[PDB]
Design a protein around this nucleic acid. Structure first.
Lengths: 222, 302, 490, 241
RNA sequence: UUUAAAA
């Protein structure tokens, strides 16, 4: 069970807050707005992805965090219908919920979900939906478990962050957006978790759709 | 890339102030109601006063003391503003005048003014000490940036707990968080910031050589009131009737009598905000230590 | 999490054979039902930690059924748990004046483990069979359930024994415990036991009020003798079953070096000598070192000779031989602590070993390891001296608060002389005081110190006649508030 | 030096002055007629500050230009040899320096008639050759005298004075040794008035004492104005005749 | 590097 709130900021087009276990990430989406000189794209929409850690300045650890989150949201947004425009997507990690130096998978999983939610509240053209979960395996039983806690990561052999794309009422999986893994694994365990990760993200979008409906519907014709 | 204010909106807010009216409905001396939200780990404080939302994160580590002060610990603070609080903040501009003036005010209020016990942060003289870091995250900008950030840092330092350390002559063993309960930081006084925004219904000429002071001063301005502001003042007091620090540079040149009046008006504010932080910290402690009445060891006799 | 889930609602099973009770406590079947015994408690006023409980019942063969009952703390504090290690590091409860650092949480030390009256309580009972001469016929150890009929104090139990219109089975049992204690104490004094004094004084609060000397009663020796008899009987039993790792306490003999400077002061100024040929000769010599004019002088020699006594020590039997188990003060072949498990952690280990000898529960391997037992004994010994030095300093502080907040004149005895200072011991307050030469005379340059007679000659303030002050002098001291808290001499 | 008496019962400070006495004030105007249009060599006590005013001129780039007023830039450069111990840090990009540079711009952009000079920029270059307490106030007086030399229209004088509070005794014009032993307040008084364009308090001061410190502070600042004014009278009279 | 007892 995860918690999520939409529309919490007053000076951005779309805001969100994704809470899972102990990790809390607040995202802010603003667009379409006037881009800069080096940012504007002639045909499609430009993205300015910025993630920030809970402690200290933004080091090179969060730079790869921006590049992976960028690859998840770029195919998800219909960029071609906003030519010569910009969209600022800022992710602020309030609580890490893990070890920042040894791990960085739970924060990527929450930044993906928080960014997608803020992209829905801002009213940006989205081709589909998104869901991301962290996956690790305990060296004891060597079985696949989703959203492992902070103590379960230090004993893990390999970590995984699977991001999927759902269509048709959050059922059909169009394409696998992101599957970042690091550790020790083989081909037999890859599909052992990829099949398990597809049914855990299916109930996530089904839970996301219920959340983003309890808040958008009252603001409309109601 | 900046906020555009229409001439009609600018004229309305000024005339509203000339009739003792504020868009949000407060008074000229009414501070916004502050809310403190403590996170999971120690040093995770979220402050919400009005629509302005700020979040502070307190950390610490072992570092080398200064060569001129080997008996004191370090205090680091950096307030980098992201486009999250508004698209007018260009990301990566750490040298911004707002970010520069914010850090220097809190640094003077906490470190230089002796709020944080730096001498108690000394482990071994001139070699090992604590370097407490205060990361302030600006979430939603609506004025009162340094007012809320100062409340967040002060609530964060009083809520944070440093690891325990046992000294065996020259060695230093940092006790894990699960091994020993962390020790809270020492706080001498509680500096609380109160900003003042000034306006003149006249002009600059009628203000330089003008005895009749027609200035309008408001406490804790909003973003729209801040963009139309002429002069700015920031004071910092504590419940001990001491002026922690004062920063007034530029804007309307005000007289000494009005600045002294700002402090006495700000003291009633900081006195109430102080007791709220002391009460909200007490309630958060009982939330974590529910059965703390049974675990007491030092008990009175008969 | 190591505490009982019932909390304050924990109750002892009314039926020890109940099928639901033995499901949560299978060792309940190995427990005696001693709830029919008329047991009472005699602890100082304001007591919260009730560890001991005594009872007496005349047997039909002319003997007595005396049995002490100790709080069964080991039923709740199990080894290996975080509750055990938290009490093992404290060692003993530190008793100050206003506060009281407890070794165990108040759920146990106050309610569940404390032998509170009118409530069923678990206990580790030691039942004897004394005759008219207070001789042990047979001893038995067992875990039992008791229900204390009363809980008198020392001043209350004294009134019930001295009263003649209260003649019931519980009061008559307290009458036997008094006549049996004086017989147990007499045979100990004849065997070589010591009887030393100590300035045991306490104060009152509302905030220091006044300093009052504590008085002794006949009931103090009542409980004391049966606590000693309990510790001795349990000592031989735990050593009979675990001779390699038995939790015991010893006391080495005082060397002739300790009583050297004391005997020189008594021989060169009072012409007295304390015998050191035996522990009995030391006790019989102190009884003859009495001054006709000062009755308190006899107790002053007992106080100054207490500092010459060697320090007691906790240990395990696997590190010494049996002739080294001797306790000099009590003149017993073996001794341990068992009658105070809420206070001292030594009794916690003694309870676990005594339960294994009876067959109640197997003793944990942490009490069968010589290395583990050695490190435990060194910690509970260091924690023992720290507790005593803390209790003396808390009494000394609150008494010192009365010195500046209550100016008066009291009589005190000197115990040591220096070239520029005099140490005085006051029985009214039970604390020592240093009077420097600058704060004693007007001209310190005209003074002389005689190291062979232990005297210091000086010219007193506001007096032109020099006074000769020796050791063991009964003088009158004063207190002032000269500060920019100071004692003087009258 | 050593353990000195800050304010003895004889009313004398560690350098000989009294509670309401100022350090020697020797200002100089038009010291760089070849490097800037405005020049002022401020020598307030041991402090030796060079202030240059280059402008008003066209900006080097048409990017930043206000078509309704002027742009006021202040460049405070604390030299490595400013104190006895040569500085090892960089000082230029220091966060404490950026606060001073900004506080000076805000202070004068309201006093300098930037409207009279639209679409222009006024560069102020400051070099501190030596410092000894009260450096902020001496930075103020240097800019005032340097703009006047450049012929920039101002509403009034801006005076910089530093005041310290030792127990219950204010002290005018604090040196370095006095700032390291008590709280310091630097004021920015406008002309002979009581209007404050600057009020910096960086150390704890009781509220019951701040008002009296401010009064004695503005009183000494007026004295600083006259010394600058009398310097301009002597410079203008000897230049015309 | 202050004996014993109940705290």
């Amino acid at each position: 069970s995860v918690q999520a709130e939409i529309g919490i900021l007053d000076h951005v087009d779309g805001s969100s807050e994704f809470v899972s276990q102990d990790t809390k990430v607040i995202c802010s989406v603003t667009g379409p707005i006037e881009p800069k000189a080096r940012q504007e794209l002639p045909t499609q929409l430009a993205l300015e992805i910025i993630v920030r850690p809970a402690k200290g300045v933004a080091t090179t650890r969060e730079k790869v965090l921006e590049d992976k989150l960028r690859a998840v949201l770029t195919p998800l947004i219909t960029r071609h219908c906003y030519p010569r425009q910009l969209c600022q997507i800022t992710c602020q990690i309030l609580e890490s919920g893990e070890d920042e130096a040894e791990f960085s998978l739970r924060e990527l999983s929450c930044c993906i979900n928080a960014a997608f939610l803020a992209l829905v509240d801002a009213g940006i053209a989205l081709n589909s939906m998104c869901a991301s979960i962290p996956i690790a395996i305990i060296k004891d039983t060597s079985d696949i478990i989703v959203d492992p806690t902070a103590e379960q990561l230090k004993i893990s052999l390999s970590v995984h962050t699977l991001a999927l794309e759902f269509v048709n009422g959050g059922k059909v999986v169009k394409n696998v957006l992101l599957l970042d893994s690091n550790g020790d694994f083989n081909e037999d365990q890859l599909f052992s978790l990829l099949e398990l990760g597809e049914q855990k993200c299916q109930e996530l979008v089904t839970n996301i759709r219920r959340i983003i409906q309890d808040n958008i519907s009252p603001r409309l014709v109601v | 890339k900046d906020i555009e204010i229409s001439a009609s909106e600018s004229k309305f807010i000024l005339e509203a102030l000339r009739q003792n009216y504020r868009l949000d409905g407060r008074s000229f001396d009414q501070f916004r109601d502050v809310e403190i939200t403590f996170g999971k780990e120690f040093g995770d404080v979220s402050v919400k006063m009005g629509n302005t939302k700020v979040h502070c994160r307190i950390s610490c580590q072992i570092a080398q003391p200064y060569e001129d002060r080997p008996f004191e610990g370090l205090f680091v603070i950096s307030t980098e503003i992201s486009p999250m609080a508004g698209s007018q903040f260009e990301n990566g501009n750490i040298t911004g005048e707002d970010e520069v003036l914010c850090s220097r005010i809190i640094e003077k209020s906490v470190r230089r003014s002796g709020a944080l016990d730096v001498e108690g942060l000394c482990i071994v003289a001139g070699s090992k000490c604590w370097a407490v870091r205060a990361d302030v995250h600006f979430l939603d900008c609506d004025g009162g940036f340094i007012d809320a950030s100062c409340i967040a840092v002060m609530a964060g330092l009083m809520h944070f707990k440093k690891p325990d350390i046992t000294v065996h002559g020259e060695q230093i063993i940092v006790h894990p968080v699960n091994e020993r309960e962390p020790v809270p930081l020492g706080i001498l006084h509680i500096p609380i910031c109160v900003t003042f925004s000034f306006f003149n219904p006249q002009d600059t000429e009628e203000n330089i050589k003008g005895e009749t002071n027609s200035e309008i001063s408001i406490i804790d301005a909003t973003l729209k009131e801040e963009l139309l502001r002429d002069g700015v003042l920031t004071v910092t007091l504590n419940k001990n009737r001491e002026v922690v620090q004062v920063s007034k540079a530029g804007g309307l040149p005000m007289d000494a009598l009005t600045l002294m009046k700002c402090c006495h008006e700000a003291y009633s504010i900081i006195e109430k905000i102080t007791d709220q932080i002391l009460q909200l910290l007490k309630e958060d402690s009982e939330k974590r230590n529910k059965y703390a009445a049974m675990l007491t060891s030092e008990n009175a006799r008969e | 999490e190591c505490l009982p889930a019932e909390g304050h609602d924990w109750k002892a099973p009314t039926k020890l054979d109940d099928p639901e009770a033995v499901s949560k406590d299978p060792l309940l079947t190995k427990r005696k039902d001693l709830r029919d015994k008329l047991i009472c408690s005699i602890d100082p006023p304001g007591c919260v930690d009730i560890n001991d409980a005594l009872h007496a019942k005349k047997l039909p063969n002319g003997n007595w059924e005396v049995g002490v009952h100790i709080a069964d703390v080991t039923h709740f504090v199990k080894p290996g748990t975080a509750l055990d290690a938290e009490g093992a590091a404290r060692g003993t409860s530190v008793y100050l004046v206003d506060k009281r650092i407890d070794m165990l949480p108040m759920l146990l030390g106050t309610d569940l483990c404390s032998l509170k009256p009118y409530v069923d309580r678990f206990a580790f009972s030691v039942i004897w069979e004394l005759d008219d001469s207070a001789n042990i016929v047979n001893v038995n150890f067992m875990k039992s359930v008791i229900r204390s009929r009363e809980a008198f104090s020392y001043e209350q139990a004294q009134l019930r024994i001295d009263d003649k219109t209260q003649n019931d089975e519980l009061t008559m049992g307290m009458r036997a415990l008094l006549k049996l204690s004086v017989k147990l104490k007499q045979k100990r004094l004849e065997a070589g036991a010591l009887n030393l004094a100590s300035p045991e004084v306490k104060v009152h609060m509302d905030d220091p009020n006044e300093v009052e000397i504590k008085k002794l009663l006949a009931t103090n020796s009542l409980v004391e003798e049966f606590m000693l008899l309990a510790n001795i009987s349990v000592a031989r039993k735990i050593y009979d079953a675990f001779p390699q790792t038995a939790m015991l306490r010893r006391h080495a003999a005082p060397p002739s070096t300790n009583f050297e400077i004391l005997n020189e002061m008594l021989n060169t100024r009072k012409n007295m000598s304390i015998s050191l040929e035996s522990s009995k000769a030391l006790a019989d010599s102190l009884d003859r070192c009495v001054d006709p004019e000062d009755p308190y002088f006899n107790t002053l020699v007992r106080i100054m000779s207490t500092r010459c006594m060697m320090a007691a020590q906790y240990f395990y039997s696997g590190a010494y031989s049996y002739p080294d188990f001797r306790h000099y003060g009590l003149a017993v072949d073996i001794y341990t602590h068992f009658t105070s498990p809420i206070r001292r952690y030594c009794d916690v280990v003694a309870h676990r070993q005594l339960a294994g000898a009876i067959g109640y529960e197997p003793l944990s391997l942490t009490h069968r390891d010589k290395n583990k037992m050695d490190m435990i004994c060194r910690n509970i010994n260091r924690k023992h001296r720290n507790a005593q030095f803390a209790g003396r300093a808390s009494i000394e502080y609150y008494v010192g608060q009365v010195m500046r907040n209550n100016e008066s004149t009291e009589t005190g005895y000197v115990i040591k002389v220096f070239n520029n200072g005099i140490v005085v011991l006051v029985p009214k307050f039970g604390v020592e005081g240093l009077i420097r030469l600058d704060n004693l005379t007007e001209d310190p340059n005209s003074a002389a110190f005689d190291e062979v007679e232990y005297k210091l000659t000086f010219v007193p303030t506001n007096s032109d006649k020099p006074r000769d002050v020796y050791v063991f002098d009964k003088v009158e001291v004063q207190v002032r508030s000269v500060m920019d808290a100071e004692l003087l001499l009258k | 030096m050593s353990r000195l008496e800050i304010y003895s019962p004889e009313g004398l400070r560690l350098d000989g002055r009294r509670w309401n006495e100022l350090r020697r004030f020797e200002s100089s105007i038009n010291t760089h007629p070849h490097a800037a249009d405005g020049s002022s060599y401020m020598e307030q006590g041991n402090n030796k500050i060079i202030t240059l005013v280059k402008g008003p001129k066209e900006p080097r780039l048409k990017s930043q230009m206000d078509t309704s007023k002027a742009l006021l830039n202040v460049s405070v450069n604390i030299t490595k040899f400013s104190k006895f111990e040569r500085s090892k840090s960089s000082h230029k990009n220091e966060r404490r320096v950026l606060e001073i540079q900004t506080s000076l711009v805000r202070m004068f952009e309201k006093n300098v008639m930037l409207n009279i000079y639209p679409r222009t920029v006024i560069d102020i270059e400051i070099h501190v050759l030596e410092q000894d307490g009260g450096i902020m106030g001496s930075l103020i007086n240097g800019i005032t005298l340097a703009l006047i030399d450049a012929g920039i229209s101002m509403f009034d004088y801006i005076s910089g004075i530093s005041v310290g509070l030792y127990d219950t005794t204010p002290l005018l014009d604090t040196n370095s040794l006095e700032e390291n032993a008590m709280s310091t307040v630097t004021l920015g008084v406008v002309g002979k008035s009581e209007k404050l364009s600057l009020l910096l308090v960086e150390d704890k001061i009781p509220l019951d004492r701040l008002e009296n410190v401010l009064a004695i502070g503005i009183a000494g600042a007026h004295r600083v104005r006259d010394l600058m004014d009398e310097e301009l009278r002597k410079h203008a009279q000897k230049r015309v005749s």
